[PDB]
């Protein structure tokens, strides 16, 4: 038992948090009432679910989640949701108005009005935990709250509990469903202000998720519901190594131990496979070799990048369902022999396989088909720098003519910090291409 | 929860606001007495943004009838939806500015704006969280212009953090009288360069144009103009008064549209606009709506969008459409008309979808766009106002009211600066 | 300048604009394309709007300058400036007439 409370900030962060908590309850057999049925004690008495959930005096299980947002409506839906009795009112913190997709508003103007209350609640939750490894943060880059307040919380946690592994999840913007025009601005702002303080970030590519759930899921116009559904699915796929007894990524420090050998290289690639639509749920289940080849294919990758153009740094394989290890080695050898997998010389780190035998569940009535064997591959490659190349030119196209900066300047932060953030991102891409070249 | 205080000034402004309140009340299923006789709660989701309920389902609009002439509220309150407004919001002067900016802003403006601000504070203290103010006024009248300018100035002084958008009804030389109106219009726009965070330009040239040749009416009357501009703001505020994926409130809108502190003027757009002697009994398809909306024949600003480049634009669609073809037609428009969009602000095109269409049309689509083509109205204002300056046309009517020519000089300087800035951003 | 100059140019402008109006409505009888019909209609309607609204009020101002009747006094230079602001719109409308002619000669 090693507790890990989670902080959910921003509109998109709260939505994906709702989704992943619903799916956690589904897999763990926890009804919305929160009680623990005798027949639903999934885990064989293991407290690996007690890592995320806290049992009250009446046997009710309460998750260690801190739903934070500056707008009341998104958390009003949580209050009116079917899991209303699952979360205590103290766990959810509401603001009087959102940051309006403005980083300075979510960081400097209105963030400080509730940062103290959020920290008090977090400390209250942490004092009851004796094996607190760290914090998992869910937030959206485009959101003014989801970037500004996320950075403020990250800095506060680092200055307070800097020895804890602060894993993070982020939502990459996408032009089709872009919330605002100023998404590159606050994206780079939070990336600069959180690069040192964060531990390991799992960016979620809204373009990529939209593409995969448009193509494979047989939906022509996916709304937010399906997007956050799939994001919750992949988040739970990642965290299954923590929620159950396993062989790889058992603790939160292991993530940074395996995927972040050095700072600023903490943006590993995530991939989930197979994904099949509910309308075609009766298709043949893909074998281990097929699903491995699928997750190595860019079609099922969930961040828009080309790993073949890049250089792998470190790869780890997570397995859910009945998966034969010998078949795993066969698939790995096949992929290595056919697909040109390149590794840096100075880091001889290989491929790590951790198999969890619990099959993955799906939301009731959702578009995702039940699958008996699924594979989630986490790898770090310099190809992810293509995302930063998407962001930096999008930023420069407006910064050269200095657009939309009057809001940020008037909200109490100096203009020079924009140039500082751009210089930091230039240094980051320099390190990326240096690792890519020096190998 | 993000309630907006709506303020209407001037005779035309008050008429416009009353008609707009009536149409949106009809859209929300509100009777003249304030009770809700609709069918769905989707209109009730964000109904509190503009309305308040007091123990009887009587949704009183958060509207303020302000005008230095008491007869304007007497005429408005006699309408079908004129009595639904809160009686305390009726503030009227006893002297009248007489279509004068100096009297309507300096002396007679203050003696009424003190009470108006008292009313505004009374509404805001009862409002949990207020995001902005809505202003409708006619720049031709010297009363409403001065009142509104004073409102914006002292509101920014009191609430620098509270955003504000306004519906500026730009008059016309061919619509209204032309004696001292250019001076008042110049002063008004000079105030709006810095006082307002957002501004919608409504131009009477294109207004009469659309009301006459597209609506096929021999002699346009102010009632039809009122109806068209009210439908325009219905479409524009569809984003605020209804929920949507974009979730655009006032500050979200300003951030996603205004790229620079001084470039806060938008040109509205409405579709379809059919004459009431040939109105189609069918519904326009997506390509037809697209080619009608982006044409110059659907903008309430008398500006040629082909002359300039679209800085940031958004399109709000109401009705039952398959949005796949909507996104398709928008991307074909972006590819085809790339010369009319500035390339240095990526993703400056926006699409919003709504399910409740306006009455009389099952399908509708409204457009708001920030373009550099609006510099030409500043140019024409300059052509009028400099020609009246070089001869000091009736300047002694403003000197004797405590207003000097230094303010007009600062106004012309700011106008020239805005024209130059728009031209330099064209490239 | 003088006031009979104002009256003379006023009647000249009204006469030419109305002559344009008659030729436009006379040519509208043929099945010219709907876009051209709309443009011609807008032009003639804008001309008539300037007729009833601009020109009647402006001749009211000529009466103001002549009889010294009304709210306050007015001089001839104000009338000159007024003719300039009418003049940009008249140049505009004759330009629109020119483009209508160009469209007509093209079809």
Curated annotation (Swiss-Prot), chain B:
Modifications after synthesis and translation: Some glutamate residues at the C-terminus are polyglycylated, resulting in polyglycine chains on the gamma-carboxyl group. Glycylation is mainly limited to tubulin incorporated into axonemes (cilia and flagella) whereas glutamylation is prevalent in neuronal cells, centrioles, axonemes, and the mitotic spindle. Both modifications can coexist on the same protein on adjacent residues, and lowering polyglycylation levels increases polyglutamylation, and reciprocally. Cilia and flagella glycylation is required for their stability and maintenance. Flagella glycylation controls sperm motility. Some glutamate residues at the C-terminus are polyglutamylated, resulting in polyglutamate chains on the gamma-carboxyl group. Polyglutamylation plays a key role in microtubule severing by spastin (SPAST). SPAST preferentially recognizes and acts on microtubules decorated with short polyglutamate tails: severing activity by SPAST increases as the number of glutamates per tubulin rises from one to eight, but decreases beyond this glutamylation threshold.
Chain location of the short sequence motif MREI motif per the record: 1-4
N6-acetyllysine: residues bearing it: 58
Residue list for modification N6-succinyllysine: 58
Membrane spanning residue stretches: none
Entry function: Tubulin is the major constituent of microtubules, a cylinder consisting of laterally associated linear protofilaments composed of alpha- and beta-tubulin heterodimers. Microtubules grow by the addition of GTP-tubulin dimers to the microtubule end, where a stabilizing cap forms. Below the cap, tubulin dimers are in GDP-bound state, owing to GTPase activity of alpha-tubulin.
Name this polypeptide is given: Tubulin beta chain
From Swiss-Prot, chain C:
Complete-protein stretch covered: 428 to 534 of 846
Protein name listed in UniProt: Disks large-associated protein 5
Description of how the protein assembles with itself and partners: Interacts with CDK1. Interacts with the C-terminal proline-rich region of FBXO7. Recruited by FBXO7 to a SCF (SKP1-CUL1-F-box) protein complex in a CDK1/Cyclin B-phosphorylation dependent manner. Interacts with CDH1.
TM segment ranges: none
PTM remark: Ubiquitinated, leading to its degradation.
Gene that encodes it: DLGAP5
Cystine residue pairs: none
Tissue-specific expression: Abundantly expressed in fetal liver. Expressed at lower levels in bone marrow, testis, colon, and placenta.
Subcellular location field: Nucleus; Cytoplasm; Cytoplasm, Cytoskeleton, Spindle
Function: Potential cell cycle regulator that may play a role in carcinogenesis of cancer cells. Mitotic phosphoprotein regulated by the ubiquitin-proteasome pathway. Key regulator of adherens junction integrity and differentiation that may be involved in CDH1-mediated adhesion and signaling in epithelial cells.
UniProt similarity note: Belongs to the SAPAP family.
